[PDB]
Design an enzyme around this catalytic site. Structure first.
Site, mmCIF file in Angstrom:
data_model
loop_
_atom_site.group_PDB
_atom_site.id
_atom_site.type_symbol
_atom_site.label_atom_id
_atom_site.label_comp_id
_atom_site.label_asym_id
_atom_site.label_seq_id
_atom_site.Cartn_x
_atom_site.Cartn_y
_atom_site.Cartn_z
ATOM 1 N N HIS B 33 -73.137 22.524 83.083
ATOM 2 C CA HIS B 33 -72.346 23.139 84.178
ATOM 3 C C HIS B 33 -71.455 23.921 84.681
ATOM 4 C CE1 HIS B 33 -70.036 19.121 83.409
ATOM 5 N NE2 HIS B 33 -69.384 19.716 84.117
ATOM 6 N N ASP B 63 -77.591 19.476 79.788
ATOM 7 C CA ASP B 63 -75.879 20.290 79.921
ATOM 8 C C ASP B 63 -75.660 20.932 78.522
ATOM 9 O OD1 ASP B 63 -73.841 20.848 81.422
ATOM 10 O OD2 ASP B 63 -73.914 18.514 82.748
ATOM 11 N N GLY B 139 -62.622 17.649 84.758
ATOM 12 C CA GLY B 139 -61.468 18.542 84.155
ATOM 13 C C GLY B 139 -62.451 18.002 82.101
ATOM 14 N N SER B 141 -64.760 17.519 81.782
ATOM 15 C CA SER B 141 -66.203 17.579 81.418
ATOM 16 C C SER B 141 -66.417 18.728 80.399
ATOM 17 C CB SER B 141 -66.767 18.750 82.607
ATOM 18 O OG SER B 141 -67.607 18.182 83.861
ATOM 19 N N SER B 156 -70.864 15.108 80.182
ATOM 20 C CA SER B 156 -71.539 15.701 81.863
ATOM 21 C C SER B 156 -70.474 15.328 82.377
ATOM 22 C CB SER B 156 -73.108 15.834 81.165
ATOM 23 O OG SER B 156 -73.940 16.322 81.889
#
Lengths: 51, 185
Positions: B33, B63, B139, B141, B156
């Site tokens: 993402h 992801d 932040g 991710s 994710s």
């Protein structure tokens, strides 16, 4: 912002700052949209990025 | 730069997953993402130091995404902070795990469930996710989930935060490594 699918329990964890009409920086869309739900929909997007 | 460190797109900040390679070509894994719609990645919030360029992305359903390094100067440590990574492994329920991300740093807990389906909304459904009791915040991710020297996953999404606690979901890293024919080092 399209918040027509909120409130959502799970969000992706990107940092994509948004500045609300309340003068507060929201970390991302999902945080912003849950905060829109919380404000009883009064909250709007002022601009993209940090306030 | 190593796993958990800040990486910057044109719109925000995520975390480096793991440094990987195929032959002599170096990349880093991150969340799909994060890579979705992003081209260039920078090492600093001024966006004056380029890291590289998005080479692949798989969001939704999975992801994960991968960024090819174009910067020959920046160190590309095969680690997550001070922790050497030397292999990849599949998650198991109860496994001792640690997550590192560019917002919250290093947090440790355990795998609570496998094969979670997580509906982020608007058709963005991800399948086959690792569930943990580790907290995470925006932040984080893309940041690694690891167990000692073993790479396990990529951050994710989740619920909650690192003040009151939460639940975080992770893309199994082995699937990302297979997709791109890359290996941790």
């Amino acid at each position: 912002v399209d918040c027509s699918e909120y409130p959502k329990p799970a969000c992706t964890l990107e940092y994509r700052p948004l500045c609300g009409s309340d003068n507060k920086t929201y970390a991302n869309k999902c945080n912003f949209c849950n905060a829109v739900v919380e404000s009883n929909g009064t909250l709007t997007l002022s601009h993209f990025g940090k306030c | 730069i190593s796993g958990g460190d800040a990486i910057y797109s044109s719109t925000g900040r995520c975390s480096l997953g793991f440094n990987v390679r195929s032959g002599s070509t170096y990349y880093f894994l991150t969340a799909g993402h994060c890579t979705d719609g992003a081209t260039t990645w920078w090492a600093n919030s001024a966006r004056t130091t380029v890291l590289g360029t998005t080479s692949g992305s798989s969001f939704p359903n999975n992801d994960y995404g991968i960024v090819r390094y174009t910067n020959t100067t920046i160190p590309k440590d095969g680690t997550v902070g001070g922790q050497d990574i030397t292999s990849a492994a599949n998650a198991t329920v109860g496994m001792a795990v640690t997550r590192r991300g560019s917002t919250t740093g290093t947090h440790s807990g355990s795998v609570t469930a496998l094969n979670a389906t997580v509906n982020y909304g608007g058709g963005d459904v991800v399948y086959g996710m690792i569930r943990t009791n580790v907290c995470a915040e925006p932040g984080d991710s893309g940041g690694p989930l690891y167990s000692g020297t073993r790479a396990i996953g990529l951050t994710s999404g989740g619920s909650g935060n690192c003040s009151s606690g939460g639940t975080t979901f992770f893309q199994p890293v082995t699937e990302a490594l297979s997709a791109y024919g890359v290996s941790v080092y």
